Design an enzyme around this catalytic site. Structure first.
Site, PDB file in Angstrom:
ATOM      1  N   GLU A 149       7.039  -0.387  -5.151  1.00 58.40           N
ATOM      2  CA  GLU A 149       7.134  -0.049  -3.740  1.00 58.40           C
ATOM      3  C   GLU A 149       5.750   0.161  -3.134  1.00 58.40           C
ATOM      4  O   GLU A 149       5.086   1.148  -3.463  1.00 58.40           O
ATOM      5  CB  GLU A 149       7.973   1.224  -3.533  1.00 58.40           C
ATOM      6  CG  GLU A 149       8.193   1.513  -2.046  1.00 58.40           C
ATOM      7  CD  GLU A 149       9.124   2.672  -1.767  1.00 58.40           C
ATOM      8  OE1 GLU A 149       9.552   3.371  -2.707  1.00 58.40           O
ATOM      9  OE2 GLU A 149       9.396   2.889  -0.569  1.00 58.40           O
ATOM     10  N   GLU A 155      -0.182   8.215   1.441  1.00 60.43           N
ATOM     11  CA  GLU A 155       0.445   8.521   0.156  1.00 60.43           C
ATOM     12  C   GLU A 155      -0.352   7.985  -1.018  1.00 60.43           C
ATOM     13  O   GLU A 155      -0.353   8.588  -2.092  1.00 60.43           O
ATOM     14  CB  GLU A 155       1.862   7.966   0.128  1.00 60.43           C
ATOM     15  CG  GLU A 155       2.700   8.553   1.250  1.00 60.43           C
ATOM     16  CD  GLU A 155       4.167   8.652   0.933  1.00 60.43           C
ATOM     17  OE1 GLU A 155       4.555   8.367  -0.226  1.00 60.43           O
ATOM     18  OE2 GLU A 155       4.926   8.999   1.856  1.00 60.43           O
ATOM     19  N   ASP A 182       9.777  -1.131   2.074  1.00 64.12           N
ATOM     20  CA  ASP A 182      10.289   0.050   2.771  1.00 64.12           C
ATOM     21  C   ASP A 182       9.858  -0.025   4.237  1.00 64.12           C
ATOM     22  O   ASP A 182       8.674  -0.130   4.534  1.00 64.12           O
ATOM     23  CB  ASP A 182       9.767   1.320   2.068  1.00 64.12           C
ATOM     24  CG  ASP A 182      10.152   2.612   2.776  1.00 64.12           C
ATOM     25  OD1 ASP A 182       9.866   2.749   3.983  1.00 64.12           O
ATOM     26  OD2 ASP A 182      10.671   3.532   2.115  1.00 64.12           O
ATOM     27  N   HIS A 208      14.291  -0.444   1.147  1.00 63.05           N
ATOM     28  CA  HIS A 208      14.463   0.904   1.700  1.00 63.05           C
ATOM     29  C   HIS A 208      14.395   0.850   3.213  1.00 63.05           C
ATOM     30  O   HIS A 208      13.469   0.261   3.770  1.00 63.05           O
ATOM     31  CB  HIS A 208      13.362   1.851   1.226  1.00 63.05           C
ATOM     32  CG  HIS A 208      13.598   2.476  -0.113  1.00 63.05           C
ATOM     33  ND1 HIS A 208      12.632   3.241  -0.733  1.00 63.05           N
ATOM     34  CD2 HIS A 208      14.664   2.456  -0.953  1.00 63.05           C
ATOM     35  CE1 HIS A 208      13.098   3.673  -1.893  1.00 63.05           C
ATOM     36  NE2 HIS A 208      14.327   3.216  -2.050  1.00 63.05           N
ATOM     37  N   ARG A 214      10.914   7.934  10.235  1.00 58.88           N
ATOM     38  CA  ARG A 214      11.653   8.154   8.991  1.00 58.88           C
ATOM     39  C   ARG A 214      12.976   8.882   9.211  1.00 58.88           C
ATOM     40  O   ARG A 214      13.567   9.379   8.250  1.00 58.88           O
ATOM     41  CB  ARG A 214      10.804   8.883   7.934  1.00 58.88           C
ATOM     42  CG  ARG A 214      11.029   8.254   6.562  1.00 58.88           C
ATOM     43  CD  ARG A 214      10.012   8.658   5.517  1.00 58.88           C
ATOM     44  NE  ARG A 214      10.241   7.893   4.291  1.00 58.88           N
ATOM     45  CZ  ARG A 214       9.579   8.069   3.157  1.00 58.88           C
ATOM     46  NH1 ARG A 214       8.631   8.992   3.081  1.00 58.88           N
ATOM     47  NH2 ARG A 214       9.876   7.312   2.100  1.00 58.88           N
ATOM     48  N   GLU A 243      16.871   5.530   3.014  1.00 58.17           N
ATOM     49  CA  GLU A 243      15.973   6.536   2.457  1.00 58.17           C
ATOM     50  C   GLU A 243      15.307   7.220   3.633  1.00 58.17           C
ATOM     51  O   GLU A 243      14.206   6.828   4.051  1.00 58.17           O
ATOM     52  CB  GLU A 243      14.936   5.903   1.530  1.00 58.17           C
ATOM     53  CG  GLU A 243      14.029   6.959   0.884  1.00 58.17           C
ATOM     54  CD  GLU A 243      12.812   6.369   0.228  1.00 58.17           C
ATOM     55  OE1 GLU A 243      12.580   6.692  -0.960  1.00 58.17           O
ATOM     56  OE2 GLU A 243      12.100   5.579   0.882  1.00 58.17           O
TER      57      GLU A 243
END
Ligand SMILES: [Co+2]
Ligand SMILES: [Co+2]
Lengths: 269, 268
Positions: A149, A155, A182, A208, A214, A243
């Site tokens: 991913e 991150e 994602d 995702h 989000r 997600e």
């Protein structure tokens, strides 16, 4: 295409009852809303009774389609590219335990934050270490399938785009490793998301979805319409897994809104 | 799956130069014929230099996939089930040294004859002693991986079949211990070899091949076709290691014949 829901679970070490309760609540929610599978995330599978999880899955007719591993990094500091080779070996051993669980369920194993960060090193060295760890994982497992991913810059500084991951897949050269794209992360990192997905093509193994904030798909400003047109174009027929934050309105409301948004996108395909 | 060659080496404690000579010629042979790795066997690892072995592996691009320990039993009397706890302790310590060597190469450590025999005791007493020694090895080593090789009745009365090894693996309860199946031994001890291999499944960690007479595969009457069909069906992607007598025609001819036979069954 099928729809799945990522369910949050308490760690089980710690609190076995909370893990079991969270898991059942999440799976019953997924089933009621209409999802065809669930996706989970666990830090260390050695402390969970997977025989009970299997019975729950059977009772609800709800497969587990993927297993996340990121808490092995965030909580336990395990990284497949750690500069300390002892920790690299422990990370590999941890992920092997995830693959043992995945084998019970026919689930994908997600390689997210457990791959680790550059930590002051060249991208080239970090990539080399990662490829070696992935090749070791493939040598250690006969059936496991992995998905990488790409994650946004906040991150990690290692594998931010679909292109980053595709380069690595070409070096690993195994159909047992693919890509997990994602939409929340791509909204930051990809120039043109439909083009990125076309480049992935057959290597897109899992997906995702969450909106730009989000939240549940439908509750931000992400263009899902162009994405699902492209998914149809490349013949994507695996899971679209929600997600997202439990927003708006909590985990149940978010799961319902997400399902409705996605169902309408998919049925008009 | 991948092909490897077991190469015999002189004991380094007795002739250090002979061990090197033997290792080099064996590794050169393996590379020449086309094997992807070698497997070795040493009685006492502490008196070999492994840094020079590693550069040899490096310069030939030839990994060492497994290390045999059986001479620790046959020559030195060391056993993981020895009734004498002091000798059992020394056996454990010896195998720990084998794991240090294996760690340099990412190799498996083979638990064959070093596990010892019943020696007049019940199967159960022998088994519990073995499990204790294996759990101690797992505590004394952090990443080492062990493979138990079932051996035929003439070599031991302790762990003769795959099913018996599987029962013991469940009691040890660690993915760091698996099974090494050997076609020569299975030809005697297993009822139905494809069925035994399917039961082993993912716990089959390593594989020894030799024909029914323990000559090069192809030179007896063992059915390798059904074995390799089964290995493909279970997704075996580990090593197939030729462990045979230097027959027919010597070590090099045996290695060539074995490779030709096995490559073809692996080709398809
Ligand atoms: Co994601
Ligand atoms: Co053997």
């Amino acid at each position: 295409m099928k729809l799945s829901l990522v369910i949050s679970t308490s760690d089980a070490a710690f609190d076995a009852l909370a893990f079991k309760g969270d898991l059942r609540k999440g799976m019953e929610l997924a089933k009621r809303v209409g999802y065809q599978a669930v996706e989970i995330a666990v830090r260390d599978p050695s402390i969970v009774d997977w025989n009970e999880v299997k019975i729950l899955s059977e009772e609800l007719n709800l497969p587990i389609c993927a297993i996340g591993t990121g808490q092995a990094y965030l909580a336990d500091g395990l990284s497949l590219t750690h500069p300390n080779d002892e920790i690299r070996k422990k990370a590999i051993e941890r992920v092997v335990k995830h693959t043992e669980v995945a084998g019970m369920f026919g689930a994908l194993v997600i390689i997210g934050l457990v791959r680790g960060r550059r930590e002051g090193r060249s991208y080239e060295e970090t990539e080399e270490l990662f490829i070696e760890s992935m090749k070791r994982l493939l040598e250690l497992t006969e059936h496991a399938k992995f998905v990488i991913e790409p994650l946004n810059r906040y991150e990690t500084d290692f594998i931010n785009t679909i292109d980053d991951a595709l380069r690595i897949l070409r070096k690993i050269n195994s159909n047992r490793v693919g890509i997990l794209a994602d939409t929340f992360h791509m909204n930051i990192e990809e120039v043109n998301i439909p083009e990125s997905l076309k480049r992935a093509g057959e290597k897109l193994y899992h997906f995702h979805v969450a909106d730009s904030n989000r939240w549940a798909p439908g509750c931000g400003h992400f263009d899902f319409r162009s994405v699902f047109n492209t998914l149809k174009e490349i013949g994507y027929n695996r899971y679209v897994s929600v997600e997202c934050l439990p927003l708006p309105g909590g985990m149940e409301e978010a799961a319902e809104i997400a399902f409705k948004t996605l169902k309408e996108l998919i049925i008009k395909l």
